[PDB]
Design a protein around this ligand. Structure first.
Ligand SMILES: *[C@@H]1O[C@H](CO)[C@@H](O)[C@H](O)[C@H]1NC(C)=O
Lengths: 170, 88
């Protein structure tokens, strides 16, 4: 009785919050260790919430040969409570036809091209979209974390640089 | 989802098929309000009654009337209602 119409990755909304606005405005580039909000659209209104919440989960896949031993595959359900330090997803806003999910990512994950899949209890998995994961100096739990803000502006978001040539005198 | 597949769990196909099918019970109930269903019913009634009587007569005359037409008819009704209620 549940059918997913389409998923909307709010790229133009969270791309500026992730400081990736200059990179794209249609593709979704996200930084590790930071939650991002997406929207799921149903085909028909849900009769009950929690039974429908129980039987659906979603996976993240990356690499040519994904596995749970290389940390290149992850599976997690749509739950209202869970560990915020690992992969998780909580519904922030509920509509008759749409849900707003806020996915969270661990501060230590493999970078590369990712793909999101959804699994129904009976039906097969369906691909929702693709996104890319990158390091960020804005996260306190990341290995690369810059305390200053102007240094972040100069060393990461700047595209115009200077190269010094000549002798030591001039 | 494949209706047929090897699953390493005992009675896996049963549970997989029931969870695949049974949430459509109200849809099965509601989709039967068209007159085409009535036409199909009136057609299949004769289409199933006539071979039943023919086979019942031949079977009764074959087994020295130990089992005849009424037994065949009531059995046909019993598994018809039961399979309609509990079938996939
Ligand atoms: C019913 O069975 C008995 C016992 O064999 C038999 O004598 C009789 O003819 C049968 N009745 C029929 C065939 O109408």
């Amino acid at each position: 009785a549940l059918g997913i119409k389409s998923c909307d990755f709010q790229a133009a909304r969270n791309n500026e919050e992730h400081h990736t606005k200059a990179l794209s405005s249609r593709r979704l580039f996200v930084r590790r260790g930071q939650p991002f909000t997406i929207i799921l659209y149903f085909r028909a209104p849900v009769r009950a919430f929690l039974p429908a919440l129980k039987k659906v989960a979603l996976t993240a896949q990356t690499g040519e040969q994904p596995s749970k031993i290389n940390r290149t595959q992850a599976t997690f359900p749509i739950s209202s409570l869970g560990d915020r330090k690992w992969w998780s997803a909580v519904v922030e806003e509920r509509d008759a036809q749409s849900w707003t999910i806020s996915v969270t990512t661990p501060a230590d994950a493999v970078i590369g091209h990712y793909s999101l899949l959804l699994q129904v209890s009976g039906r097969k998995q369906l691909l929702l979209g693709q996104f890319t994961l990158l390091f960020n100096p804005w996260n306190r739990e990341d290995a690369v974390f810059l305390k200053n803000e102007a240094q972040r502006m100069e060393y990461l978001l700047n595209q115009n640089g200077l190269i010094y040539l000549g002798t030591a005198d001039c | 989802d494949d209706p047929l597949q090897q699953t390493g769990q005992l009675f896996g196909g049963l549970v997989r098929d029931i969870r695949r099918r049974y949430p459509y019970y109200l849809s099965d109930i509601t989709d039967a309000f068209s007159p085409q269903v009535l036409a199909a019913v009136i057609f299949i009634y004769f289409a199933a009654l006539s071979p039943a009587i023919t086979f019942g007569g031949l079977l009764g005359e074959k087994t020295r009337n130990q089992m005849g037409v009424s037994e065949l008819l009531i059995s046909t009704a019993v598994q018809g209602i039961l399979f309609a209620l509990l079938g996939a």
